[PDB]
């Protein structure tokens, strides 16, 4: 779940596949501007720490 321990999971350090559930969303750019906005729940490993 996003924002908690295990928001991203990987089966091993070297494993190629990754599970990510972080609630990433995009938003429109403000007029006359080029910047790719987004809002996205902060990390759950940092939160757990």
């Amino acid at each position: 779940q996003p924002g908690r321990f295990g928001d991203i999971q990987s089966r091993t350090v070297e494993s190629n596949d990754l599970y990510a559930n972080t609630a990433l969303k995009l938003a429109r750019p403000s007029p006359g501007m080029v910047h790719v906005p987004y809002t996205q729940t902060p990390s759950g490993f940092k939160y757990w720490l």
């Binding site: 501007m33 080029v34 910047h35 790719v36």
Partner: protein, 262 residues
């Protein structure tokens, strides 16, 4: 030698406020700050790469920075990084800088111009380092234990890290149009520019020479410099050129490493 920095160029991006609360397109814009070392060192990304000259030669005194699709040079002194207090610069290479800072709520970086003007950028960043162990000391003692920790080293060897680079987009500019009398003139100097004028028959394309349309005014033409010879960066503040992307890679200096602290 090797000199990867001869295919890469400094760029101009957007800074939300440039030390005065106002926004402008600045040559010292701050990309991600990385703080994944236990001793509490930071890695800031400039947009102006520091340690190389205009003429692409290595130098410890000159730093490269963009100035209106023209690369200029600044002195390594006057590079200031700060938070609530004032930081100590440990490392210096390319886009990246290393520093140790007092706790604060923002940080800004600044350099001199060629005209000796301060150019800066500050971002909101919550810095509150905590030393490793079970005590929240500030300065190391003359008598204590050694506990393992990690930092960024000053080696600039092969690193196993990435930056994506790509060709810069065609930068628009309007200072190259001159209207004399019913005719337009486009300036030159070694830069091939694209033009698109809605005056008469087909008169679009790229050029390396002056011409006169002899038909319409400057309300219809524009100039987009297409400097297309060297990589810039994959930054969210500058557009891409082509739909499926092109991409590249460059290693970054200062890898993470194991040490002990007292």
């Amino acid at each position: 030698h090797f000199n990867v920095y001869k295919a890469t160029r400094p760029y101009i991006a957007y800074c939300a406020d440039c030390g005065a609360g106002h926004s402008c397109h600045s040559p010292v814009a701050i990309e991600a700050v990385r703080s994944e070392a236990t001793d509490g060192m930071l890695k800031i990304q400039f947009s102006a790469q520091i340690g190389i000259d205009k003429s692409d030669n290595h130098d410890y005194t000159k730093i490269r920075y963009a100035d209106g699709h023209a690369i200029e040079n600044a002195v390594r002194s006057s590079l200031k990084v700060a938070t609530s207090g004032d930081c100590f610069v440990h490392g210096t290479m390319g886009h990246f800088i290393l520093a140790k800072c007092p706790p604060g709520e923002f940080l800004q970086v600044s350099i001199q111009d060629t005209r000796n003007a301060v150019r800066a950028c500050r971002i909101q960043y919550h810095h509150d380092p905590q030393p490793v162990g079970r005590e929240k000391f500030t300065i190391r003692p003359h008598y204590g234990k050694e506990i393992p920790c990690t930092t960024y080293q000053q080696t600039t060897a092969k690193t196993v890290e990435e930056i994506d680079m790509h060709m810069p987009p065609d930068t628009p500019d309007r200072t190259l149009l001159s209207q004399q009398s019913g005719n337009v003139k486009i300036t030159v100097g070694g830069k091939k520019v694209k033009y698109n004028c809605t005056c008469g028959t087909g008169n679009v394309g790229t050029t390396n020479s002056d011409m006169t349309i002899n038909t319409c005014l400057i309300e219809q033409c524009h100039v987009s410099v297409t400097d297309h010879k060297k990589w810039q960066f994959n930054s969210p503040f500058v557009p891409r050129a082509d739909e499926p992307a092109r991409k590249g890679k460059v290693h970054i200096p200062f890898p993470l490493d194991n040490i002990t602290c007292r």
